[PDB]
Design a protein around this ligand. Sequence first.
Ligand code: MG
Ligand code: MG
Ligand code: MG
Ligand code: MG
Ligand code: MG
Ligand code: MG
Ligand code: MG
Ligand code: MG
Ligand code: MG
Ligand code: ZN
Lengths: 113, 97, 51
Amino acid sequence: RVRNSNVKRAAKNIVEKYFPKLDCDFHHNKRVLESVTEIQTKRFKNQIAGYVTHLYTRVEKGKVKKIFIKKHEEERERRENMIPSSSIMDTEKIEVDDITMQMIKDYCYRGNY
Amino acid sequence: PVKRKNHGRAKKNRGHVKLIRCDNCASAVPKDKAIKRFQIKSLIEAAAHDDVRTATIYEEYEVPKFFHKNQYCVSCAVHLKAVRCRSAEGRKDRSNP
Amino acid sequence: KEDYVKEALSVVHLKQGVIGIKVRIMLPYDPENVNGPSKVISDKIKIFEPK
RNA sequence: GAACGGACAACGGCCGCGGGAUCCGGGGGCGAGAGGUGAAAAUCGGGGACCCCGCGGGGACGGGCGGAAGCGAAGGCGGCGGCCGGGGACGUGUCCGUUGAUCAAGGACGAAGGCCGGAGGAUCAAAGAUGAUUAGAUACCGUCGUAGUUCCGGCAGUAAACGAUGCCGACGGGGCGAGGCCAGGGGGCUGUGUCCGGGAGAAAUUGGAGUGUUUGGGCUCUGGGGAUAGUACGGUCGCAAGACAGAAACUUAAAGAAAUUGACGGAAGGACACCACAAGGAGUGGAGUGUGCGGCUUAAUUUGACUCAACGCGGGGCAGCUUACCAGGGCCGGAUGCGCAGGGAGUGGUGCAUGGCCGUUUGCAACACGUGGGGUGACCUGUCUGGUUGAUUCCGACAACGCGUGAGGCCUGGGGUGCAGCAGGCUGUGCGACGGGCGGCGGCAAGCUGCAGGAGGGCAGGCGAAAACAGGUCAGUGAUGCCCUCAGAUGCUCUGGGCUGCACGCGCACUACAAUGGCGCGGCGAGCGGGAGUGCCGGGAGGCGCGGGCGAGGCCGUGGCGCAGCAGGGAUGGGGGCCUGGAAGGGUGCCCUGAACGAGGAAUUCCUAGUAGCCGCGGGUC
Ligand SMILES: [Mg+2]
Ligand SMILES: [Mg+2]
Ligand SMILES: [Mg+2]
Ligand SMILES: [Mg+2]
Ligand SMILES: [Mg+2]
Ligand SMILES: [Mg+2]
Ligand SMILES: [Mg+2]
Ligand SMILES: [Mg+2]
Ligand SMILES: [Mg+2]
Ligand SMILES: [Zn+2]
């Protein structure tokens, strides 16, 4: 069945606040949920903890664009710092097409068609 | 009110466009107002094309095309669904897919 | 519903006829039951804080 | 305005050439149909149709190209060539020099249909005729067919002759186009559409419908609420049809415009459901009976409800009571304030005066606020293109963002077992399923779907939003306004009768029409509900006396009957025995009689798994 915003916004908060304490197995993922929240009825725990596992599977792939986890940007900034092959050194004697050089005739360098 | 900016037909800078007969209703519609769908399909349908390969005298026979200009009046063109039901803002589309 | 809304009915007899006035009031949650029910509504949840 | 230049042109008039198609004639072939339709008929067909091939005749018509492309003042103009004529734009140190703009009067042109005279007549086709359709059908559909459609000379002078937008002129944003001429420097003129803005506008919209209360460019025409009515009279025109022009009397408080929200649609597209359908099962309607409703009858056969949402419903199984009705008789709860006042009572009336409750929309998924945005505004967005879900459930894109009801969550029962307690075992406490896992679709996905695991993968109920409805209830009420009645009472009570009458119509059920059955013995036998058995008498029903205390149809085995209105069926009726009650039309038991009914017309209900159906049992009523 389809979960609602009372479950999905809840389970979004659980994976967002408490991501490292979670795991892909559901029964461990429910065992954190009584320890760390207060949810009254045992069916509605299973509604939430089920969708937490359905979130934690795709956040393990990192697919969701909304939620944001402290580990997942510090790993991202390592990926952000590419060893830079910027073409400012790679381009030598820049080939600029015939009319593009004429606009730079006042102050010019690296002239090629 | 005025429903369409061109008043349904493509007539601009004319006084008169000669009527044509509907291909389905035989109504008298002007050539400008008439819905025209030029269909170019093969003479033999695509289901039977394997059966004409076995039966041709000719190696590499090309099945000929069938050329017909369906010209529909407005009443039958919505009934034959040659023109699709669109919204009011969807009416101003002109491009074919 | 049986905890949180308490509803009332009183009837009025006037010159014109009978008027019935229903008052249904939602109660605020309070852990001490002097103001409302002790158990929360089942859809509401509490999340603790990580720090 | 005139000239000129190279271009451009479905501009016109005429002449000539040509194109294929429809129809007809004729020849040849073929051999039974063809035609036409939603379906058919009319019609033509062995006297050879249709179809195929050739020839011939004739009129009409230019397909494809053919377009938001050209031209013309408009109507209009589309094969080709030629002649005569016209046209605008462009280009120019050509000419003239204000010759202009707009118009009463007047004149010319003017689609279609129409008219006159002449020619012609293929198609189509008013009228007319038929064949159908239909309740009817003078129509729509089929066939035929005259005027007409065609040409020439004229009349006529009308169109939604529309851009529903007069002509001339000045000024005014960008973009894209497929015109023509010029220039060669994403150029200029002039047409032409389009898109987005500005401004305008009641708005739709709109490069004019802009430059308008900051109101004045010129000129012409028209309108002054609707209807009467584009009618009458007079006039002019016309062969006529009629045209032009054009009132009033009487009458009327609206008619109208554009847009919004609903509702509806024999509009298109979705989605969904056993008050749907398919695939099915059992039926109902037929029969008899039970019961309810109508009608009729009657002293009365009280009454509410009449589409789902009236009709085994009012927990409505009525002998009295109930009980409102009828025939009678009693009785006065006619208090209280000095015969009257007024209270009180009424199953009297009004549910179209009401409360409450309940039904129905719902077996739904809808409803709303805060703030912001769009619009002058009602309103819209939020509340959605799409995908998804039983769900406005969610994913997502998003002038919206955040919330709230409903949905969900929830509560109860059901299955699995952990612990605990205690004794057809009982009841506490938990656990257990979330769609989690996996595969494939969809991927910010929501989710869908298959399998594994599992006791269990949409279990059954419960509460159930906003809005409604003139839904039902005044006959549940010490819930009630108002009206009527109150002593010969519409009060209460008693007795009897009725609510159970019966030519008839209808709803829902029951038992059947039998052999997959029925009857007779033996054997085995449930759950809800947990109070009841016992001994004796009786053939049964039943009775009596003690008294902590229950279990079904059926199924299995077997005997008879053996396709029969038969041991199917058990209706109706007769005689007897009992029970309850004050009182039998009630119930039960015994014997006998032994009806229709041999599978039920048009129609029509319910239903997806421990379900339908079959089969009993218990409880409410009592
Ligand atoms: Mg015209
Ligand atoms: Mg012949
Ligand atoms: Mg004419
Ligand atoms: Mg004519
Ligand atoms: Mg003539
Ligand atoms: Mg004909
Ligand atoms: Mg006259
Ligand atoms: Mg309107
Ligand atoms: Mg009585
Ligand atoms: Zn048509």
